[PDB]
Write a protein that binds this ligand. Sequence first.
Ligand SMILES: *P(=O)(O)OCC(C)(C)[C@H](O)C(=O)NCCC(=O)NCCSC(=O)C[C@H](O)CCCCCCCCCCC
Ligand SMILES: *P(=O)(O)OCC(C)(C)[C@H](O)C(=O)NCCC(=O)NCCSC(=O)C[C@H](O)CCCCCCCCCCC
Ligand SMILES: *P(=O)(O)OCC(C)(C)[C@H](O)C(=O)NCCC(=O)NCCSC(=O)C[C@H](O)CCCCCCCCCCC
Ligand SMILES: [Cl-]
Lengths: 76, 76, 75, 336, 338, 336
Amino acid sequence: MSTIEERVKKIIGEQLGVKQEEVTNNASFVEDLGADSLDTVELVMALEEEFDTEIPDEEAEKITTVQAAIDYINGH
Amino acid sequence: STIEERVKKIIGEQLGVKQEEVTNNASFVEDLGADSLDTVELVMALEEEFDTEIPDEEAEKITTVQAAIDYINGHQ
Amino acid sequence: MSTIEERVKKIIGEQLGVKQEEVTNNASFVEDLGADSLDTVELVMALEEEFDTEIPDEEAEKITTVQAAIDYING
Amino acid sequence: SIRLADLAQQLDAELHGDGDIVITGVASMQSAQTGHITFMVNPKYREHLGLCQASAVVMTQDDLPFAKSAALVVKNPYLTYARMAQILDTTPQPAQNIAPSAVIDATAKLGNNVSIGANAVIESGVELGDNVIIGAGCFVGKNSKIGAGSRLWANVTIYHEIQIGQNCLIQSGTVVGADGFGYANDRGNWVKIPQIGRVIIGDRVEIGACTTIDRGALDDTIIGNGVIIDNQCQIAANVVIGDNTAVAGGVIMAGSLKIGRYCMIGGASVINGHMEICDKVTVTGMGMVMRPITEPGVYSSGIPLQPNKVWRKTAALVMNIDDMSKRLKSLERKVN
Amino acid sequence: HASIRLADLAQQLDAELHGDGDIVITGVASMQSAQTGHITFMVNPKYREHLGLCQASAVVMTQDDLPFAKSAALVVKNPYLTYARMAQILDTTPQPAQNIAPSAVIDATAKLGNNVSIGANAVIESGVELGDNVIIGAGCFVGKNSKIGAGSRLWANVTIYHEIQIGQNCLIQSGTVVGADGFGYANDRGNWVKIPQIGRVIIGDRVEIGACTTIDRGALDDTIIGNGVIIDNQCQIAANVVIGDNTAVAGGVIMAGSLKIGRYCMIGGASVINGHMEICDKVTVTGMGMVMRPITEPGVYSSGIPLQPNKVWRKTAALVMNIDDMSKRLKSLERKVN
Amino acid sequence: SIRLADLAQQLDAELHGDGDIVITGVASMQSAQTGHITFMVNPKYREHLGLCQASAVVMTQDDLPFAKSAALVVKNPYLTYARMAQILDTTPQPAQNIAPSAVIDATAKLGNNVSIGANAVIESGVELGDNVIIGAGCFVGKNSKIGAGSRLWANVTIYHEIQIGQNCLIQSGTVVGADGFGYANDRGNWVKIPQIGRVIIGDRVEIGACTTIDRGALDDTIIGNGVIIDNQCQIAANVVIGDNTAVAGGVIMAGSLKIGRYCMIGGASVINGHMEICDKVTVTGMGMVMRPITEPGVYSSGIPLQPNKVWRKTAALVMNIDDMSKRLKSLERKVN
Ligand SMILES: *P(=O)(O)OCC(C)(C)[C@H](O)C(=O)NCCC(=O)NCCSC(=O)C[C@H](O)CCCCCCCCCCC
Ligand SMILES: *P(=O)(O)OCC(C)(C)[C@H](O)C(=O)NCCC(=O)NCCSC(=O)C[C@H](O)CCCCCCCCCCC
Ligand SMILES: *P(=O)(O)OCC(C)(C)[C@H](O)C(=O)NCCC(=O)NCCSC(=O)C[C@H](O)CCCCCCCCCCC
Ligand SMILES: [Cl-]
């Protein structure tokens, strides 16, 4: 029922505790959404669970924005 | 040998008190000197002996000896 | 490709940050090899993975020396 | 020394027993003898009244049937204990008038009935309010201000441009207003950033011994009214602490932390900086406060002691928890 | 009351001035507090939109910040370092003392260099040497034969024990104790027997030490603090610790004896460090680090489990303490499945 | 300096080598030169002994065959090290004479051979036993008593009504007897509870620098005979510490803790209050002591450093261990 983009943004929102209106595709986890170093790791783990996937860390270090989180899941 | 007696034994073993202090109206915290981890540990102990899983919302309502007995009885 | 002695000694050396001269067979981990409180436990884990085995706690507490380690692994 | 009846009325407590009983002091239940008043807070100890040698006991209404002596009945025995201990206090003052060995700058401005202990040093431009007491060996730095009724025990250091409110109390060895830990890095070399903010301490603040409160870099470190701070604490530059907050011993706070009102910070906690903790938050002891706290309530951290042999295995397993996690996923997959 | 033309300040800071050079700058202030005559700075680009709100006469910033400026701007590459320099230029901090107080007690065998100041009721022991421009704050004690190098300064109520050496241009805040006995005791059938601590403390040049910090003297050989080291408040630096040049130690760090720390390290506040071991150059330990083992490779290292809601934490704690059981059930399931 | 044979006798050591050797001081095994005596406790340094340039080495009977210098043979080289370093101690005293600049109340009682350093302040009713030495800048409060042979380094603060035994030693910046952290909560306002108990310190106690030991609320804080306490410790109100216990640096103790005899508390430990630790307990460093300890032995807590990127994953998995626990249970079912 939910799109991939919706599922990714929902999790970013719940994990960083921000309003869905703030989860902009250009938002940076750290600079914009105020993620600390643990938050981003917890964020990735939550993405692995939602989409039942594994994220090699070399890719995971590239997931620093909303768009980047979507792109990994997307293959985009 | 009964549920009431097996529960009352585990409690005493858990809280380091005699089997005569374990009155049915006894509160773990207020009467039996339970500390912040004592009740969580007690619940884990009961879950193991009686082969059940107790949800966190019931567990926080098990503050007395009788409430513990009542729960196990109602769950096999 | 390595003999059991060579494998066991290599694991110990890596865990304890010691050279292969230090790693004599009579060597005690704590006394002679300067291991700390977590090193023996973690060393025992290092063996369980390298050898793809499973050492019972009962057996694990007798491995305190290089020779005792090698001796368990030959089994 | 006081008559029980006078004591009861000054405590606004209900006298039950001979009001002419002479109370000479406060004592614990186990130590109390004739002449002593004590108190009971926990109903667990009602039996112990039958073994207590006090001339009087402060207790509640539901405790009174259990009494074996004169009693004062109140709603809050512990608060009443605090008040009667004040009435019967034996604690002396840090100093008595102005010592001839004190070194006081000619431009210092002293209010009425100020006391200053032997070998204390008061710098230029300092203002001490009425009834202020400066203990032996203190230093009070340039242009600092200490409000009426405030008191410093021996060997307290106050830096320059510090403001302390009324009726405060600071114990020995405490240092208020030292430089914040402010340095810029120049290709590995540290370059000092002068800390030209201050510390502002409100009214009725009590600070323990060997505690350090740094001055701010630019704006001020701020301690609100009615705050209590225990020993061995570090309050870094530009920390702001809301009214009536309590900070137990050995707490370390990073710079630019803002703490709200009515918080209780458990001893030995470590608190990250540039962030906020809202009102009505309790942090239990040794808390690792890494993130802001936005909702009131109680928060904790730490894995408690175990027998050493057990801990070894615990710690080793935790350090390899990621491998446990993988083995778990790999097993869930195999089953399904 | 400092007073400096903005053009003259820009010149001293090697900054590119955008705006009126005749502006008179009287001090540094924060963006929120700055008034006319104040200079301030900005590092975080998040404050760009804030610039309009600011009442400062000038703001130190980067080239990229410039289009957002609404005041005279000083453009530099490193605004934070420039802030440090301009803060120093306009520093209002007083000195711990000036001249020699008549109430000071100075042993006649003590040697004082040129322009030395010594505060009221300070106590200087026999054999002490104080270099030129040294400043000893009020109520300090400086012990027998100790040597304090040129330009070094002690705030009030610092304690320096005997045979201590401090280099040039150091700064030590109040309540700090340098050179107390290390915690040295031999056990004789359960009774502790004191081991005299006859080593010393050797502090380098340009070292800054915070308040209520204790640096113990060595047992035999010396406790050593390298050049350019910075140490915050309430730290314990035990006997025979050696700290390499330019290392930073934040508040409340506890270090065990005979620890060796390399150069350019950053030790996070409230960390606890085991002894008789070595940490290499360029290691960062984050706050509350439990440093049990040597560190042989540069990088960042961390420990600790952060706060949770108390109800949640109770369950987390209980589960971690029972983690061996969990490990055994997991293994048990693996062999069953296979 | 001392003849090696004369030193060996005082150390009850069996001498092997030239007794006419002149010993001038103690030094480390790597720094020792002609005229120094050193010691060996670790048998690993046996084949290193040829490199050492000491004139004499303290060692065991089993070490004797490897000796490459004059050797003192004993049962316990480390203890022998302590005694010989005491014999050859270069440490000066905190003071000699009574300083003209010291401020001593007329009602203070001084024993024979008391020394009091410059600018020390001694209050009324104070008693100092024979050979007591008070360092410069100290404060000793009203009615306090310091037993014979005890010594305070500079800038130590002793409050009022404190009792210290014989042959104690206290390093600089330490504060003994400050108010315990005692307050009653009145509807969110803190009300001070005067702390009228005391601190009782026994004989042969050694306390480090910038340590704080608070006075009791009603009954006393008590430090047993032969206790050693390192720097930066917080010993709260009404703590009782049993004889011969050692407390390493940075330890924080809550009020009303009782600790038995012969314990060792590792540095930076944090200990909960209103409970008891029995005799012969060791707590390793950074111990989180939440619960009573009823059996002797060694106890530990804490998860040690990991590379930061490893640590982030560790912390996240631990914080979510409940979920991991549940995934384990369900998987235990799916194959039952
Ligand atoms: P549960 O209640 O949910 O959790 C149990 C714990 C976390 C152990 C417990 O409730 C707790 O945090 N207790 C004490 C917190 C505290 O700060 N206690 C001291 C009260 S004031 C006093 O003792 C004066 C003294 O000077 C204090 C100095 C510092 C005290 C050290 C705190 C010890 C914390 C224990 C950690 C396990
Ligand atoms: P992530 O970045 O990989 O990990 C998250 C952590 C580890 C929290 C984070 O990166 C971090 O360490 N930030 C730096 C925290 C810090 O040390 N802040 C203080 C800097 S200097 C200071 O303010 C001076 C003051 O006088 C003393 C400092 C007191 C000690 C600070 C406690 C550290 C907090 C850690 C978690 C509770
Ligand atoms: P293992 O033995 O079963 O466990 C390993 C640990 C826990 C690391 C180890 O045994 C241990 O506890 N070591 C040292 C504990 C201690 O208090 N050591 C100090 C001896 S006295 C000294 O060094 C003088 C100094 O003044 C003491 C200051 C306090 C320093 C405490 C460091 C604790 C280190 C623990 C891990 C980070
Ligand atoms: Cl601490």
